[PDB]
Amino acid sequence: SEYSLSVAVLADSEIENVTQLTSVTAPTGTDNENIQKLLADIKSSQNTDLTVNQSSSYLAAYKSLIAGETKAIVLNSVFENIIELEYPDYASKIKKIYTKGFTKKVEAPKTSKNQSFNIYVSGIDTYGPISSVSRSDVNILMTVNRDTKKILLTTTPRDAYVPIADGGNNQKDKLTHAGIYGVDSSIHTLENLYGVDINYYVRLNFTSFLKMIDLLGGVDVHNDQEFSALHGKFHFPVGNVHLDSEQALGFVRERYSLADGDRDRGRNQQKVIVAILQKLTSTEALKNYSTIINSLQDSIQTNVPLETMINLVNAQLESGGNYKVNSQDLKGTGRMDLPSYAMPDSNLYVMEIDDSSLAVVKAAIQDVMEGR
Numbered sequence: 001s002e003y004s005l006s007v008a009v010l011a012d013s014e015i016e017n018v019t020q021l022t023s024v025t026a027p028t029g030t031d032n033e034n035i036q037k038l039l040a041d042i043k044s045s046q047n048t049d050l051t052v053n054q055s056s057s058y059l060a061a062y063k064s065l066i067a068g069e070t071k072a073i074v075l076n077s078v079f080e081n082i083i084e085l086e087y088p089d090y091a092s093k094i095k096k097i098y099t100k101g102f103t104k105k106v107e108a109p110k111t112s113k114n115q116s117f118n119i120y121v122s123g124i125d126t127y128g129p130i131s132s133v134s135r136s137d138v139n140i141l142m143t144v145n146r147d148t149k150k151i152l153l154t155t156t157p158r159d160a161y162v163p164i165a166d167g168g169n170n171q172k173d174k175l176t177h178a179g180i181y182g183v184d185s186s187i188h189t190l191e192n193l194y195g196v197d198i199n200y201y202v203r204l205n206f207t208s209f210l211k212m213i214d215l216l217g218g219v220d221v222h223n224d225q226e227f228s229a230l231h232g233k234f235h236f237p238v239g240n241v242h243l244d245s246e247q248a249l250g251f252v253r254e255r256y257s258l259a260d261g262d263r264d265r266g267r268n269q270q271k272v273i274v275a276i277l278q279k280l281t282s283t284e285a286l287k288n289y290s291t292i293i294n295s296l297q298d299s300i301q302t303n304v305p306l307e308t309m310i311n312l313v314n315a316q317l318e319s320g321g322n323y324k325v326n327s328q329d330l331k332g333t334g335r336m337d338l339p340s341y342a343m344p345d346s347n348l349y350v351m352e353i354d355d356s357s358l359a360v361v362k363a364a365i366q367d368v369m370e371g372r
């Protein structure tokens with residue numbers, strides 16, 4: 001995967017190039033490896049040595065820039081998406097006078113040595129091409145035991161206040177923000193939280209989801225409470241409900257009017273995962289798995305190797321047998337007085353994790369993996 005570091009100044013700055021600078025503001029406490037490589041590239045190509053004025057973060061460096069407290073900053077493209085949360089117009093306030101491309105080695109999928117594996121499902125809250133960066137509002141761990149034919153779905157509330165791995169610097173913030181840093185941040189955040197290996201991920205957005213439901217001929221669920229979605233457009237009665245793509249999207253996004261709010265939304269998402277699974281494991285869909293990949297490969301990202309898809313599909317085609325699916329949710333207390341690493345200047349709702357819930361969730365994950 002690709003990212004870049006840049007030297008940025010204000011849009012109307014008289015500074016045109018890096019040789020005109022003596023110093024640059026940069027968060028060398030937290031992004032030193034990348035920063036030093038940029039400084040080395042600059043020294044190599046422009047024979048210019050810059051001293052660093054340390055900032056506490058990319059956000060802090062940006063604030064110093066617009067306040068006129070520094071002439072120039074280092075910007076890492078990954079963290080521009082974080083700056084954008086507090087400063088939506090940041091791109092229009094700056095120009096870049098130097099740019100360096102970087103590549104990060106992609107962490108391979110982990111192959112289980114046994115019958116059990118974990119897939120992480122990340123749902124991104126935007127329409128459009130799948131490369132669109134947004135928050136991960138769906139965060140569901142699928143623990144799959146092929147021996148016992150059991151699946152446990154563990155949802156972690158998107159507001160869950162947890163140490164965010166990688167770009168999050170292991171500081172506490174709402175889980176959904178990890179999706180802004182990228183799927184690796186999301187994955188490592190949940191591996192660390194639950195003490196498990198996540199073997200694979202699937203990342204999809206609103207547009208990806210609609211396309212998928214369309215291709216599968218809709219999905220069928222049992223709806224447990226009457227509710228409506230999307231400003232009253234869809235009405236969902238109690239009982240068996242068929243959902244086309246638009247109905248299904250409404251069905252997984254509504255929270256405010258549900259008896260248990262965001263917890264019920266998560267449960268609704270789990271219902272839809274089961275329903276999708278029932279369509280994906282029909283004889284017809286399994287046979288046509290190639291067509292499904294071809295039709296959805298542009299909109300759904302995954303590191304499940306092709307060989308692994310082939311194996312799972314063909315094993316299922318030969319064996320049959322449905323998975324018994326159970327669901328759980330990590331619990332906690334909603335608070336508005338705890339600091340966000342990504343957005344230190346905003347009062348955000350976060351969910352402080354309940355320790356005993358965490359222990360139960362981890363124990364349930366291990367049990368399903370070990371066949372208990």
Ligand SMILES: CC(C)=CCC/C(C)=C\CC/C(C)=C\CC/C(C)=C\CC/C(C)=C\CC/C(C)=C\CC/C(C)=C\CC/C(C)=C\COP(=O)(O)OP(=O)(O)O
Nearest residue numbers: 123124125137204205206209252253269272273280281312
């Ligand atoms: C059959 C095969 C392929 C294999 C064999 C299967 C086998 C042998 C075994 C079974 C296990 C395996 C291998 C696979 C199972 C299949 C998998 C991995 C997944 C199926 C499920 C899936 C891909 C998706 C379902 C995800 C889902 C419920 C929703 C996604 C919708 C999105 C993108 C976003 C919603 C965002 C929300 C809630 C609010 C934003 O809304 P907003 O932001 O406006 O609101 P606010 O923010 O304010 O709240």
Ligand SMILES: [Mg+2]
Nearest residue numbers: 125135137176
């Ligand atoms: Mg959202």
